[PDB]
Subunit: 114 residues, 4 copies
Protein backbone atom coordinates (compact mmCIF):
# COMPACT_ATOMS: atom_id res chain seq x y z
CA UNK A 1 0.00 0.00 0.00
CA UNK A 2 3.03 2.37 0.34
CA UNK A 3 5.91 3.08 -2.04
CA UNK A 4 8.46 5.87 -1.90
CA UNK A 5 10.22 7.10 -5.04
CA UNK A 6 13.15 9.56 -5.05
CA UNK A 7 14.56 11.33 -8.09
CA UNK A 8 17.69 13.52 -8.63
CA UNK A 9 17.10 16.78 -10.56
CA UNK A 10 20.88 17.50 -10.89
CA UNK A 11 21.80 14.28 -12.70
CA UNK A 12 18.42 13.38 -14.16
CA UNK A 13 18.34 9.98 -12.52
CA UNK A 14 16.85 7.93 -9.79
CA UNK A 15 18.29 8.82 -6.38
CA UNK A 16 19.86 5.48 -5.44
CA UNK A 17 20.76 4.28 -1.93
CA UNK A 18 18.82 7.05 -0.16
CA UNK A 19 17.79 6.18 3.42
CA UNK A 20 14.08 6.49 4.05
CA UNK A 21 12.42 6.22 7.47
CA UNK A 22 8.67 5.96 8.01
CA UNK A 23 7.03 6.83 11.35
CA UNK A 24 3.49 6.58 12.65
CA UNK A 25 2.14 9.19 15.07
CA UNK A 26 1.40 7.63 18.48
CA UNK A 27 -1.40 8.50 20.90
CA UNK A 28 0.97 10.74 22.90
CA UNK A 29 1.94 12.68 19.69
CA UNK A 30 5.41 11.16 19.44
CA UNK A 31 6.68 9.54 16.19
CA UNK A 32 7.10 5.79 16.46
CA UNK A 33 9.30 3.97 13.99
CA UNK A 34 7.18 2.11 11.43
CA UNK A 35 9.34 1.03 8.35
CA UNK A 36 12.57 1.93 6.71
CA UNK A 37 14.91 1.04 3.86
CA UNK A 38 17.17 2.41 1.14
CA UNK A 39 16.03 3.27 -2.36
CA UNK A 40 16.88 0.77 -5.09
CA UNK A 41 18.61 1.37 -8.43
CA UNK A 42 15.25 2.63 -9.71
CA UNK A 43 15.00 5.19 -6.93
CA UNK A 44 12.14 3.17 -5.39
CA UNK A 45 11.52 1.66 -2.06
CA UNK A 46 8.96 -1.11 -2.06
CA UNK A 47 7.95 -3.55 0.65
CA UNK A 48 7.72 -1.08 3.50
CA UNK A 49 4.43 -2.36 4.89
CA UNK A 50 1.39 -4.53 4.34
CA UNK A 51 -2.28 -3.66 4.01
CA UNK A 52 -2.90 -5.17 7.44
CA UNK A 53 -0.34 -3.02 9.23
CA UNK A 54 -0.99 0.26 7.30
CA UNK A 55 -4.04 1.41 9.24
CA UNK A 56 -5.51 4.90 9.20
CA UNK A 57 -3.38 7.45 10.99
CA UNK A 58 -0.80 10.15 10.49
CA UNK A 59 2.48 9.01 8.95
CA UNK A 60 5.81 10.76 8.35
CA UNK A 61 8.23 9.80 5.59
CA UNK A 62 11.73 11.13 6.26
CA UNK A 63 14.16 11.08 3.32
CA UNK A 64 17.88 11.43 4.11
CA UNK A 65 18.68 14.02 1.48
CA UNK A 66 21.70 15.48 3.22
CA UNK A 67 23.66 12.23 3.11
CA UNK A 68 22.71 11.74 -0.52
CA UNK A 69 24.17 15.08 -1.58
CA UNK A 70 27.22 14.76 0.63
CA UNK A 71 28.03 11.35 -0.99
CA UNK A 72 28.02 13.16 -4.36
CA UNK A 73 30.30 15.83 -2.95
CA UNK A 74 27.62 18.47 -3.21
CA UNK A 75 26.68 20.95 -0.41
CA UNK A 76 22.97 20.81 0.40
CA UNK A 77 20.58 23.11 2.22
CA UNK A 78 18.17 20.80 4.03
CA UNK A 79 18.82 18.35 6.88
CA UNK A 80 16.27 15.98 5.34
CA UNK A 81 12.97 16.08 3.49
CA UNK A 82 9.91 15.12 5.56
CA UNK A 83 6.47 14.33 4.19
CA UNK A 84 3.61 14.14 6.72
CA UNK A 85 0.13 12.93 5.74
CA UNK A 86 -2.98 11.10 6.88
CA UNK A 87 -3.76 7.61 5.55
CA UNK A 88 -7.53 7.47 4.93
CA UNK A 89 -9.55 4.31 4.22
CA UNK A 90 -12.21 6.17 2.29
CA UNK A 91 -9.66 7.19 -0.36
CA UNK A 92 -7.79 5.03 -2.81
CA UNK A 93 -5.72 2.19 -1.36
CA UNK A 94 -2.24 2.61 -2.83
CA UNK A 95 0.07 5.50 -1.97
CA UNK A 96 3.19 6.58 -3.82
CA UNK A 97 5.14 9.36 -2.11
CA UNK A 98 7.53 10.86 -4.67
CA UNK A 99 10.27 13.43 -4.12
CA UNK A 100 12.36 15.25 -6.74
CA UNK A 101 15.58 16.51 -5.15
CA UNK A 102 17.90 19.43 -5.79
CA UNK A 103 20.62 20.70 -3.43
CA UNK A 104 18.59 23.75 -2.27
CA UNK A 105 15.06 22.61 -3.14
CA UNK A 106 12.72 19.70 -3.44
CA UNK A 107 9.31 18.89 -4.88
CA UNK A 108 7.06 16.22 -3.42
CA UNK A 109 3.77 14.76 -4.53
CA UNK A 110 1.41 11.92 -3.70
CA UNK A 111 -0.07 9.54 -6.28
CA UNK A 112 -2.96 7.77 -4.60
CA UNK A 113 -4.76 5.10 -6.63
CA UNK A 114 -6.96 1.95 -6.50
CA UNK B 1 13.63 4.79 -25.56
CA UNK B 2 11.01 7.50 -24.73
CA UNK B 3 8.19 7.53 -22.18
CA UNK B 4 6.10 10.46 -21.01
CA UNK B 5 4.43 10.45 -17.59
CA UNK B 6 1.91 13.07 -16.40
CA UNK B 7 0.67 13.53 -12.86
CA UNK B 8 -2.10 15.71 -11.31
CA UNK B 9 -1.10 17.68 -8.18
CA UNK B 10 -4.73 18.75 -7.44
CA UNK B 11 -6.19 15.24 -7.17
CA UNK B 12 -3.04 13.30 -6.37
CA UNK B 13 -3.42 10.98 -9.31
CA UNK B 14 -2.16 10.12 -12.71
CA UNK B 15 -3.33 12.61 -15.36
CA UNK B 16 -5.35 10.28 -17.59
CA UNK B 17 -6.30 10.88 -21.25
CA UNK B 18 -3.91 13.82 -21.70
CA UNK B 19 -2.89 14.45 -25.33
CA UNK B 20 0.84 14.44 -25.90
CA UNK B 21 2.56 15.43 -29.15
CA UNK B 22 6.24 14.87 -29.87
CA UNK B 23 8.11 16.84 -32.56
CA UNK B 24 11.62 16.65 -33.97
CA UNK B 25 13.43 19.82 -35.05
CA UNK B 26 14.03 19.80 -38.83
CA UNK B 27 17.02 21.20 -40.73
CA UNK B 28 15.08 24.42 -41.47
CA UNK B 29 14.31 24.89 -37.71
CA UNK B 30 10.64 23.96 -38.02
CA UNK B 31 9.04 21.30 -35.76
CA UNK B 32 8.06 18.15 -37.62
CA UNK B 33 5.53 15.79 -36.10
CA UNK B 34 7.26 12.71 -34.68
CA UNK B 35 4.85 10.74 -32.30
CA UNK B 36 1.73 11.31 -30.32
CA UNK B 37 -0.80 9.63 -28.06
CA UNK B 38 -2.92 10.01 -24.94
CA UNK B 39 -1.79 9.08 -21.46
CA UNK B 40 -3.10 5.81 -20.06
CA UNK B 41 -4.84 5.15 -16.73
CA UNK B 42 -1.37 5.21 -15.15
CA UNK B 43 -0.64 8.65 -16.55
CA UNK B 44 1.93 7.09 -18.91
CA UNK B 45 2.44 7.10 -22.58
CA UNK B 46 4.54 4.26 -23.88
CA UNK B 47 5.27 3.11 -27.41
CA UNK B 48 5.96 6.51 -28.91
CA UNK B 49 9.07 5.49 -30.83
CA UNK B 50 11.73 2.86 -31.39
CA UNK B 51 15.48 2.94 -30.84
CA UNK B 52 15.98 3.00 -34.60
CA UNK B 53 13.84 6.07 -35.18
CA UNK B 54 14.90 8.04 -32.05
CA UNK B 55 18.16 9.45 -33.40
CA UNK B 56 20.13 12.31 -31.90
CA UNK B 57 18.48 15.67 -32.33
CA UNK B 58 16.31 18.23 -30.62
CA UNK B 59 12.85 17.06 -29.61
CA UNK B 60 9.81 18.85 -28.20
CA UNK B 61 7.18 17.17 -26.05
CA UNK B 62 3.94 19.16 -25.95
CA UNK B 63 1.43 18.20 -23.24
CA UNK B 64 -2.16 19.42 -23.67
CA UNK B 65 -2.66 20.70 -20.15
CA UNK B 66 -5.36 23.21 -20.98
CA UNK B 67 -7.79 20.56 -22.23
CA UNK B 68 -7.05 18.41 -19.21
CA UNK B 69 -8.03 21.13 -16.75
CA UNK B 70 -11.01 22.27 -18.77
CA UNK B 71 -12.38 18.66 -18.77
CA UNK B 72 -12.22 18.81 -14.95
CA UNK B 73 -14.02 22.13 -14.97
CA UNK B 74 -10.98 23.95 -13.69
CA UNK B 75 -9.59 27.23 -15.17
CA UNK B 76 -5.92 26.90 -16.09
CA UNK B 77 -3.14 29.38 -16.81
CA UNK B 78 -1.05 27.75 -19.52
CA UNK B 79 -1.96 26.91 -23.13
CA UNK B 80 0.15 23.75 -22.86
CA UNK B 81 3.37 22.54 -21.27
CA UNK B 82 6.31 22.13 -23.65
CA UNK B 83 9.55 20.31 -22.88
CA UNK B 84 12.43 20.81 -25.34
CA UNK B 85 15.65 18.79 -25.10
CA UNK B 86 18.49 17.19 -27.03
CA UNK B 87 18.69 13.39 -27.38
CA UNK B 88 22.37 12.43 -27.01
CA UNK B 89 23.87 9.02 -27.82
CA UNK B 90 26.71 9.42 -25.36
CA UNK B 91 24.25 9.57 -22.45
CA UNK B 92 21.99 6.86 -21.12
CA UNK B 93 19.57 5.29 -23.58
CA UNK B 94 16.14 5.54 -21.95
CA UNK B 95 14.33 8.83 -21.39
CA UNK B 96 11.34 9.45 -19.15
CA UNK B 97 9.89 12.96 -19.41
CA UNK B 98 7.67 13.54 -16.38
CA UNK B 99 5.36 16.47 -15.66
CA UNK B 100 3.49 17.27 -12.44
CA UNK B 101 0.55 19.56 -13.21
CA UNK B 102 -1.32 22.23 -11.29
CA UNK B 103 -3.74 24.79 -12.77
CA UNK B 104 -1.23 27.70 -12.56
CA UNK B 105 2.05 25.77 -12.39
CA UNK B 106 3.91 22.71 -13.46
CA UNK B 107 7.11 20.85 -12.63
CA UNK B 108 8.98 18.77 -15.19
CA UNK B 109 11.98 16.50 -14.94
CA UNK B 110 13.90 13.98 -17.00
CA UNK B 111 14.92 10.52 -15.77
CA UNK B 112 17.57 9.25 -18.15
CA UNK B 113 18.88 5.73 -17.54
CA UNK B 114 20.58 2.65 -19.11
CA UNK C 1 17.35 37.57 8.24
CA UNK C 2 14.45 35.13 7.73
CA UNK C 3 11.51 35.56 5.37
CA UNK C 4 8.93 32.97 4.37
CA UNK C 5 6.97 33.25 1.07
CA UNK C 6 4.05 30.99 0.15
CA UNK C 7 2.33 30.77 -3.26
CA UNK C 8 -0.84 28.98 -4.38
CA UNK C 9 -0.45 26.89 -7.58
CA UNK C 10 -4.21 26.36 -7.99
CA UNK C 11 -5.20 30.02 -8.05
CA UNK C 12 -1.98 31.59 -9.26
CA UNK C 13 -1.80 33.91 -6.29
CA UNK C 14 -0.03 34.49 -3.03
CA UNK C 15 -1.15 32.12 -0.27
CA UNK C 16 -2.50 34.61 2.24
CA UNK C 17 -3.04 34.08 5.96
CA UNK C 18 -0.97 30.91 6.10
CA UNK C 19 0.23 30.14 9.63
CA UNK C 20 3.96 29.53 9.97
CA UNK C 21 5.80 28.24 13.06
CA UNK C 22 9.56 28.26 13.40
CA UNK C 23 11.46 26.05 15.84
CA UNK C 24 15.13 25.73 16.81
CA UNK C 25 16.77 22.57 17.98
CA UNK C 26 17.90 22.89 21.65
CA UNK C 27 20.93 21.32 23.28
CA UNK C 28 18.71 18.48 24.55
CA UNK C 29 17.61 17.76 20.95
CA UNK C 30 14.04 19.01 21.45
CA UNK C 31 12.39 21.54 19.10
CA UNK C 32 12.03 24.84 20.90
CA UNK C 33 9.54 27.46 19.70
CA UNK C 34 11.48 30.23 18.00
CA UNK C 35 8.99 32.41 16.23
CA UNK C 36 5.61 32.37 14.39
CA UNK C 37 3.36 34.49 12.23
CA UNK C 38 1.00 34.50 9.25
CA UNK C 39 1.60 35.35 5.60
CA UNK C 40 0.41 38.74 4.42
CA UNK C 41 -1.62 39.65 1.34
CA UNK C 42 1.64 39.28 -0.69
CA UNK C 43 2.16 35.74 0.65
CA UNK C 44 5.17 36.93 2.65
CA UNK C 45 6.00 36.73 6.31
CA UNK C 46 8.55 39.25 7.51
CA UNK C 47 9.63 40.20 11.03
CA UNK C 48 10.08 36.68 12.46
CA UNK C 49 13.49 37.37 13.97
CA UNK C 50 16.49 39.70 14.26
CA UNK C 51 20.11 39.14 13.28
CA UNK C 52 21.01 39.07 17.01
CA UNK C 53 18.46 36.41 17.91
CA UNK C 54 18.96 34.26 14.78
CA UNK C 55 22.09 32.48 15.93
CA UNK C 56 23.65 29.30 14.51
CA UNK C 57 21.43 26.30 14.81
CA UNK C 58 19.14 23.79 13.19
CA UNK C 59 15.82 25.41 12.38
CA UNK C 60 12.43 23.99 11.33
CA UNK C 61 9.92 26.11 9.44
CA UNK C 62 6.47 24.52 9.62
CA UNK C 63 3.94 25.86 7.11
CA UNK C 64 0.35 25.01 7.98
CA UNK C 65 -0.80 23.99 4.53
CA UNK C 66 -3.71 21.81 5.64
CA UNK C 67 -5.57 24.60 7.29
CA UNK C 68 -5.01 26.78 4.25
CA UNK C 69 -6.61 24.25 1.75
CA UNK C 70 -9.45 23.24 3.88
CA UNK C 71 -10.58 26.85 3.97
CA UNK C 72 -10.78 26.75 0.14
CA UNK C 73 -12.95 23.57 0.20
CA UNK C 74 -10.04 21.26 -0.69
CA UNK C 75 -9.22 18.34 1.47
CA UNK C 76 -5.44 18.21 0.98
CA UNK C 77 -2.95 15.40 1.32
CA UNK C 78 -0.32 16.78 3.68
CA UNK C 79 -0.62 17.82 7.33
CA UNK C 80 1.90 20.64 6.83
CA UNK C 81 5.05 21.37 4.91
CA UNK C 82 8.21 21.37 7.08
CA UNK C 83 11.57 22.76 6.01
CA UNK C 84 14.59 21.78 8.22
CA UNK C 85 17.99 23.37 7.76
CA UNK C 86 21.18 24.49 9.47
CA UNK C 87 21.45 28.30 9.50
CA UNK C 88 24.28 30.78 10.12
CA UNK C 89 26.97 28.20 10.60
CA UNK C 90 29.45 30.27 8.51
CA UNK C 91 28.26 33.54 9.92
CA UNK C 92 25.07 35.44 9.40
CA UNK C 93 23.11 34.95 6.19
CA UNK C 94 19.72 36.07 4.95
CA UNK C 95 17.27 33.26 4.21
CA UNK C 96 14.12 33.20 2.15
CA UNK C 97 12.16 29.96 2.48
CA UNK C 98 9.63 29.71 -0.35
CA UNK C 99 6.87 27.15 -0.88
CA UNK C 100 4.53 26.62 -3.86
CA UNK C 101 1.44 24.74 -2.78
CA UNK C 102 -0.99 22.36 -4.44
CA UNK C 103 -3.51 20.09 -2.70
CA UNK C 104 -1.44 16.92 -3.19
CA UNK C 105 2.01 18.40 -3.74
CA UNK C 106 4.38 21.20 -2.85
CA UNK C 107 7.72 22.56 -3.92
CA UNK C 108 10.08 24.38 -1.60
CA UNK C 109 13.34 26.22 -2.16
CA UNK C 110 15.71 28.46 -0.29
CA UNK C 111 17.34 31.70 -1.40
CA UNK C 112 20.40 32.35 0.79
CA UNK C 113 22.33 35.61 0.51
CA UNK C 114 25.29 37.06 2.30
CA UNK C 115 24.76 40.64 3.57
CA UNK C 116 28.54 41.31 3.21
CA UNK D 1 2.43 44.35 -16.06
CA UNK D 2 4.91 41.52 -16.76
CA UNK D 3 7.80 40.44 -14.55
CA UNK D 4 9.93 37.31 -14.86
CA UNK D 5 11.79 35.83 -11.85
CA UNK D 6 14.30 32.99 -12.09
CA UNK D 7 15.85 31.05 -9.18
CA UNK D 8 18.68 28.50 -9.06
CA UNK D 9 17.86 25.31 -7.08
CA UNK D 10 21.49 24.10 -7.06
CA UNK D 11 23.01 27.17 -5.45
CA UNK D 12 20.03 28.53 -3.57
CA UNK D 13 20.30 31.90 -5.23
CA UNK D 14 18.75 34.10 -7.85
CA UNK D 15 19.59 33.02 -11.40
CA UNK D 16 21.39 36.12 -12.63
CA UNK D 17 21.97 37.19 -16.23
CA UNK D 18 19.46 34.75 -17.66
CA UNK D 19 18.28 35.77 -21.13
CA UNK D 20 14.52 35.95 -21.57
CA UNK D 21 12.61 36.41 -24.85
CA UNK D 22 8.91 37.15 -25.02
CA UNK D 23 6.78 36.53 -28.10
CA UNK D 24 3.14 37.22 -28.99
CA UNK D 25 1.08 35.16 -31.36
CA UNK D 26 0.14 37.21 -34.48
CA UNK D 27 -3.03 36.99 -36.53
CA UNK D 28 -1.22 34.68 -38.98
CA UNK D 29 -0.36 32.31 -36.10
CA UNK D 30 3.37 33.11 -36.13
CA UNK D 31 5.29 34.08 -32.96
CA UNK D 32 6.21 37.74 -33.17
CA UNK D 33 9.02 39.17 -31.03
CA UNK D 34 7.47 41.18 -28.23
CA UNK D 35 10.20 41.98 -25.78
CA UNK D 36 13.46 40.64 -24.26
CA UNK D 37 15.94 41.24 -21.47
CA UNK D 38 18.16 39.60 -18.86
CA UNK D 39 17.57 38.86 -15.19
CA UNK D 40 19.22 41.18 -12.70
CA UNK D 41 21.25 40.34 -9.60
CA UNK D 42 17.91 39.62 -7.83
CA UNK D 43 16.90 37.14 -10.55
CA UNK D 44 14.18 39.52 -11.73
CA UNK D 45 13.46 41.06 -15.07
CA UNK D 46 11.36 44.20 -14.97
CA UNK D 47 10.56 46.74 -17.70
CA UNK D 48 9.63 44.30 -20.50
CA UNK D 49 6.42 46.08 -21.44
CA UNK D 50 3.81 48.72 -20.58
CA UNK D 51 0.12 48.35 -19.82
CA UNK D 52 -0.65 50.04 -23.17
CA UNK D 53 1.50 47.68 -25.23
CA UNK D 54 0.57 44.49 -23.32
CA UNK D 55 -2.75 43.89 -25.03
CA UNK D 56 -4.82 40.68 -25.08
CA UNK D 57 -3.07 37.81 -26.73
CA UNK D 58 -1.24 34.53 -26.43
CA UNK D 59 2.26 35.12 -25.12
CA UNK D 60 5.36 32.89 -24.91
CA UNK D 61 8.09 33.57 -22.38
CA UNK D 62 11.27 31.72 -23.34
CA UNK D 63 13.88 31.44 -20.59
CA UNK D 64 17.33 30.53 -21.87
CA UNK D 65 18.19 27.95 -19.25
CA UNK D 66 20.78 26.05 -21.30
CA UNK D 67 23.09 28.97 -21.63
CA UNK D 68 22.76 29.67 -17.92
CA UNK D 69 23.88 26.09 -16.83
CA UNK D 70 26.60 25.69 -19.29
CA UNK D 71 28.27 28.77 -17.84
CA UNK D 72 28.32 26.99 -14.44
CA UNK D 73 29.98 23.86 -15.96
CA UNK D 74 26.74 21.86 -16.05
CA UNK D 75 25.55 20.33 -19.24
CA UNK D 76 21.78 20.56 -18.72
CA UNK D 77 18.91 18.60 -20.16
CA UNK D 78 16.60 21.24 -21.59
CA UNK D 79 17.19 23.71 -24.44
CA UNK D 80 15.11 26.37 -22.68
CA UNK D 81 12.03 26.66 -20.52
CA UNK D 82 8.99 28.08 -22.36
CA UNK D 83 5.84 29.35 -20.68
CA UNK D 84 2.79 29.90 -22.99
CA UNK D 85 -0.36 31.62 -21.77
CA UNK D 86 -3.28 33.84 -22.71
CA UNK D 87 -2.97 37.29 -21.08
CA UNK D 88 -5.36 40.18 -20.46
CA UNK D 89 -8.40 38.50 -21.91
CA UNK D 90 -10.61 39.80 -19.05
CA UNK D 91 -8.89 43.14 -18.94
CA UNK D 92 -5.47 44.12 -17.76
CA UNK D 93 -3.72 42.00 -15.15
CA UNK D 94 -0.24 41.94 -13.67
CA UNK D 95 1.72 38.76 -14.30
CA UNK D 96 4.75 37.33 -12.59
CA UNK D 97 6.22 34.31 -14.36
CA UNK D 98 8.58 32.48 -12.00
CA UNK D 99 10.90 29.56 -12.74
CA UNK D 100 13.03 27.44 -10.36
CA UNK D 101 15.84 25.77 -12.26
CA UNK D 102 17.83 22.57 -11.88
CA UNK D 103 20.03 20.94 -14.53
CA UNK D 104 17.50 18.21 -15.39
CA UNK D 105 14.29 19.81 -14.13
CA UNK D 106 12.40 23.04 -13.64
CA UNK D 107 9.27 24.29 -11.96
CA UNK D 108 7.29 27.27 -13.18
CA UNK D 109 4.33 29.15 -11.76
CA UNK D 110 2.39 32.31 -12.39
CA UNK D 111 1.22 34.95 -9.93
CA UNK D 112 -1.62 36.94 -11.51
CA UNK D 113 -3.05 40.00 -9.78
CA UNK D 114 -5.69 42.51 -10.65
CA UNK D 115 -4.59 46.16 -10.27
CA UNK D 116 -8.23 47.17 -9.51
O1 LIG E 1 7.26 7.89 -11.52
C1 LIG E 1 7.36 9.22 -11.21
C2 LIG E 1 8.17 10.05 -11.98
CL1 LIG E 1 9.03 9.42 -13.31
C3 LIG E 1 8.26 11.41 -11.66
C4 LIG E 1 7.58 11.97 -10.58
C5 LIG E 1 7.69 13.37 -10.25
C6 LIG E 1 7.67 13.83 -8.94
C7 LIG E 1 7.77 15.19 -8.61
CL2 LIG E 1 7.73 15.59 -6.95
C8 LIG E 1 7.91 16.14 -9.62
O2 LIG E 1 8.02 17.45 -9.32
C9 LIG E 1 7.95 15.71 -10.94
CL3 LIG E 1 8.10 16.78 -12.26
C10 LIG E 1 7.83 14.34 -11.24
C11 LIG E 1 6.80 11.10 -9.83
C12 LIG E 1 6.67 9.74 -10.13
CL4 LIG E 1 5.67 8.74 -9.17
O1 LIG F 1 9.45 35.46 -5.17
C1 LIG F 1 9.35 34.13 -5.48
C2 LIG F 1 8.49 33.70 -6.48
CL1 LIG F 1 7.55 34.86 -7.37
C3 LIG F 1 8.40 32.35 -6.80
C4 LIG F 1 9.13 31.38 -6.11
C5 LIG F 1 9.02 29.97 -6.44
C6 LIG F 1 9.11 28.98 -5.45
C7 LIG F 1 9.02 27.62 -5.76
CL2 LIG F 1 9.16 26.52 -4.46
C8 LIG F 1 8.80 27.22 -7.07
O2 LIG F 1 8.69 25.89 -7.37
C9 LIG F 1 8.69 28.18 -8.06
CL3 LIG F 1 8.43 27.79 -9.71
C10 LIG F 1 8.80 29.53 -7.75
C11 LIG F 1 9.97 31.83 -5.10
C12 LIG F 1 10.10 33.19 -4.79
CL4 LIG F 1 11.17 33.68 -3.52
Amino acid sequence: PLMVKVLDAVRGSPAINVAVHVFRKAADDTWEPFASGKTSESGELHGLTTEEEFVEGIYKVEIDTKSYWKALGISPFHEHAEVVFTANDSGPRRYTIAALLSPYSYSTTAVVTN
